[model samples]
Target: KMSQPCPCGSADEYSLCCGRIVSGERVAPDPSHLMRSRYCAFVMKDADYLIKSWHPTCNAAAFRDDIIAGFANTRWLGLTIFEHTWSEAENTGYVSFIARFSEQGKNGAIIERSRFIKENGQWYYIDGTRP
Candidate 1:
C-alpha cells in the first residue's frame, strides 16, 4: 500500500504528495497543498496530524475526541478542490472544496470553503464554512 495513490485523489503517489506532508517529512507548500493534506489525513485516520495542522488558538484539544471518533465510523471517498485563493500580503488563503464520504452505508458530501493562515512559514487550517 505504500505505492498507492493519494487519498486526496491527486492522481499521484501518496509518498510524493500528501503522505509526506502528513508524516511530518515536510510542510505544505501552500494552502491548497495543506487542504489536500488535511483531507488525506482524515482518510488515513491520523488524529495527530489533523490536530497538528490546526491553528493553535482554534481549540484543537476540544475537538480531538470527535476527530478520533469520526474516523472510526466515516470512510472518506474523495476530495475535489474547486478553487483556491492566496493573499501573500495578508498571509491568508481560502480553498473551496467538496469532500465525499460514507458512513454505515450512507453516502455524504461536505461542501465547504476552508480558511487557512500561514504562520512561521507553516500553513494551518483555521476554519471552514459551508457553501
Candidate 2:
C-alpha cells in the first residue's frame, strides 16, 4: 500500500515516489535511490536500514551511532531532492541533496551526496559524503 504523502515528504503518492524506484519503473540507477532512501531513513528512523544501505567499507557502527544520536536531538522537517543518478549494471549510485531539520535552537540542513547499491533486487543504504 502506498502512503498519501511519501516518506520523502513529497506531495506525490508513495507509488509515484520511492515505490516507483523500488518497483524499477524508475531506476535510482544513479543517485535517486540513495536520495529517496535517505529521506526514508529519516522518516522511519530505522538505524538498521541506514546501516544496511551504507557502503560495505563504510564504518557502519560509527555511522549508525551518529545517525541515532543526531536523530535524537533533531526534528526532521522535510526533504528536497537536488540530484541523483545510478548504473543498472553495477547496481550502484549516488544522490545529492539537503535534508531540512531543526536542532539546537535553530533550523538547519544536512547536505549530502549519498551512495547506494542494490542487493538481491532490493536497494540498500550504503554510505554518504557530506558536501
Top-scoring candidate (lDDT):
1
Cα error of candidate 2 at position 85, Å: 1.7
Tens-place lDDT per residue, model 1, 1-131, is 54688888888999989999998999898999999998988888888988999999987889899999888998888899999999889899999999898989999998999999999999999988887
* Alpha-carbon runs more than 4 Å astray in model 2: 1-4, 13-30, 59-65, 118-122
Q: What would the TM-score be for candidate 2 when compared with the true structure?
A: 0.66
| Pairs of colliding residues, candidate 1 | none
Candidate 2 lDDT tens digits, 19-131: 66544476544456546755676666767756655666676867677888867888888777777777779887767878888888799988888767787665666677986
TM-score of each: 0.93, 0.66
lDDT of each: 0.91, 0.70
The deviation in Å at residue 49 for candidate 2 is 1.6
Best by TM-score: 1
